[PDB]
């Protein structure tokens, strides 16, 4: 079985809209989301459908861009670092689970390169 997905709503959690978080949605997430290699990363890994009974034994902090997108749209984060951490967790999970050079890793590498290029222009917090 699949675990519940990561939390995207929590009324009592402290949260903000900041200019940096706005950039993370409008530039960073949008750029990665539209890419031809986004699809494995647009939703939680479905370990049931893919018959990957070890995935959620190995990966204990799952993360995906569908979750990130929801968190950004809901203004769920407190700060940009929290969101950047989610992207990095997503990439790192991929590299932990998949084999170096395999198609999924290649896809993650392409997205991560773009991520790094866009986060270069993260604005100073207003």
């Amino acid at each position: 079985m699949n675990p519940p997905p990561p939390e995207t709503s929590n009324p009592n959690k402290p949260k903000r809209q900041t200019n940096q978080l706005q950039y993370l949605l409008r530039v960073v997430l949008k750029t990665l989301w539209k890419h031809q290699f986004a699809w494995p990363f647009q939703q939680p890994v479905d370990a049931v459908k893919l018959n990957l009974p070890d995935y959620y034994k190995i990966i204990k902090t799952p993360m995906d861009m569908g979750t990130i997108k929801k968190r950004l749209e809901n203004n769920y984060y407190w700060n940009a670092q929290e969101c950047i951490q989610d992207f990095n967790t997503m990439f790192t999970n991929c590299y932990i689970y998949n084999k170096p050079g395999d198609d999924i890793v290649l896809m993650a590498e392409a997205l991560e390169k773009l991520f790094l290029q866009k986060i270069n222009e993260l604005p100073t917090e207003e």
Partner: peptide, 8 residues
């Protein structure tokens, strides 16, 4: 190359 993840 062909990835194990999708080798259902």
């Amino acid at each position: 190359f062909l990835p194990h993840k999708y080798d259902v």
